[PDB]
Symmetry: C3
């Protein structure tokens, strides 16, 4: 008997498709999912799946992410659902999770092929930027008044690192920091990147206008030099996915194309 | 002749379906509406209905909510549209409105049945939690930097009350208060609940990360103990609906299941 | 050979339809577009179009807006794409752009007709309000804690001006200002208008509740008198469109109907 697997996020569902694995559950989402799962039961929001639906499906494994573990682990345990929280905070961690899914579900060849493809794409960006002069970068996540600083330990920080950017924040131990803006202004990043995950682009544009008028950020050289980018929310999520090669290539354009 | 009724919100439209009433107008919404109204004219945003469409429909009654009365009453009066603003700030108030709609539109039996079902569900939660030790709860509505404190006088406060939670805010007269965070930290709620009505879950997750880094909230015991929940926006609206029994059951899980 | 044109926003696509021009590219959007372009290739977000798709289409011209020029100009130049950034910061500027598109693409008669219709609608509002006593107005764009003041130099400021409103901000040179709220309170606008472009109405309602509790705004007479309006985001965009006649008529209702 094939294992009965519930995937609770779009990113995991895409990995399951590349691994040629059937699913009994998929997340409820407005995003397009692989066609093979067109008729699979939806199990609610990735950020809070519907435990009663999932229980009914009697799965052998429910797949979520490390970043959601604190939020969802108790509910799964309470419902007697076996669950695996995959670490998608870097591309490398995602690739190890892909390897481990191959081993867990008898798809070692498919996982190996997928990782080979990813690594080839990543290696090409690394090679492309290796001899370039590197810009310093400040990564912000959030909305006006509450921006978090994103370190190398989060996925968007990993993309900046792999594309050769030098994060203005160093030697930190957390994924997201509260912004110390006077310190950041003195550090003077060459480039500022912003992510408002899930937010409509029209709202993000409004935020862009606010940033330019704000004493808090307007005297940064990056603002004066028009080196502030909004990361396409549709392509740059908070955690890793198969979108990474495309995301890394877009990152390379922003860091060096100007 | 049947009365010509315009329902301007999803919640009211669902009540009209349970009352077996025809409609000449429904709100414009991306949410699924009862199938019987598939071909009914849409009348614009619940938060600002299209008065020119509604006028054309020559309704006998337009139904909105108390919470929107201040915003919409003048427009309706100016357009010579008769309108009823239903109080959905508690389940009990919603049930009285259901009774009154039954009387107004000759659906007393249907309203009585609907209220019987609701009351049976509510009574079961009350019975379930009656002998449990009760946690203190802080309810926040909004986005980083501008969270409102939600009292017992608003619908989400009513759900907390009915599920046995003790609001840290007492003896207030308003539905929403400005947050006095130092006071709230000293009150030390066992649990913090957050609602960002209408906001995509992916954005809410981002807010969750910001909350944990913010000096303003991070030293609350509830944060240290991982007792902060985001209320599923799709299920917990700002005002009451037929979703209430499901919402109350989910509330009971959060307050006691941990 | 007909020119190969890519329209990167909904507003421009609607103008191209009125000008009876074929398109090779349209923006990717959830909004309804003119039916004649049902099968036209989508080219990504208006706020960051997909340059690789657009390159493939080998267009003669890519159309965007002045307000996006700073963000998008370098990418287009880098991709060797000819691009025109149309000034939609007022109705009059939009009408000059319509005239110039007619000349550029051999649609002078169609552009002239479209502008005649627009001007007739605008003239009617101007005539309607000419002898009315004019209210002072404060226009805010954004979200709690980060509202920008909108001047006459931005499109929503232009609508207020044309409908007879007197902006409390005068003799400015920029489209958007940081809010000096103590100054604004002393200026005491008769009416406050708010725009959260792209934001779901349910979120905007939540913001409305927050505004009323905020010491920063609650002592304005406009708040005390219930003269604060949320501009329907679906109809009042950040920059001009063919929606303007409808928008101007709704503006006239808010400024004088009360
Ligand atoms: Cl993760
Ligand atoms: Cl209400
Ligand atoms: Cl513009």
């Amino acid at each position: 008997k094939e294992p009965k697997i519930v995937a609770t996020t779009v990113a995991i569902t895409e990995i399951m498709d590349k691994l040629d694995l059937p699913l009994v559950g998929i997340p409820s989402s407005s995003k397009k999912l692989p066609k093979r799962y067109a008729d699979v039961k939806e199990t609610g929001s990735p950020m809070g799946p519907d435990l009663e639906i999932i229980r009914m499906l009697k799965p052998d494994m429910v797949l979520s992410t490390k970043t959601l573990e604190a939020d969802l682990k108790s509910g799964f345990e309470g419902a007697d659902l076996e669950a695996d929280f995959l670490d998608f905070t870097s591309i490398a961690s995602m690739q190890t999770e892909i390897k481990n899914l191959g081993a867990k579900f008898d798809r070692i060849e498919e996982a190996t092929k997928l990782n080979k493809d990813l690594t080839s794409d990543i290696d090409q960006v690394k090679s492309n930027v290796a001899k370039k002069k590197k810009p310093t970068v400040l990564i912000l996540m959030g909305v006006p008044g509450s921006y978090l600083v994103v370190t190398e330990h989060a996925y968007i920080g990993d993309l900046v690192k792999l594309a050769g950017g030098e994060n203005v924040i160093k030697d930190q131990k957390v994924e997201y920091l509260a912004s110390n803006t006077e310190y950041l202004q003195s550090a003077n990043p060459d480039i500022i990147l912003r992510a408002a995950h899930g937010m409509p682009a029209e709202v993000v544009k409004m935020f862009d206008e606010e940033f330019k008028t704000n004493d808090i950020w307007k005297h940064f050289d990056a603002v004066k030099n028009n080196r502030v980018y909004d990361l396409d929310e549709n392509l740059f999520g908070m955690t890793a996915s198969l979108n990474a090669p495309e995301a890394l290539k877009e990152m390379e354009k922003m860091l060096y194309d100007n």
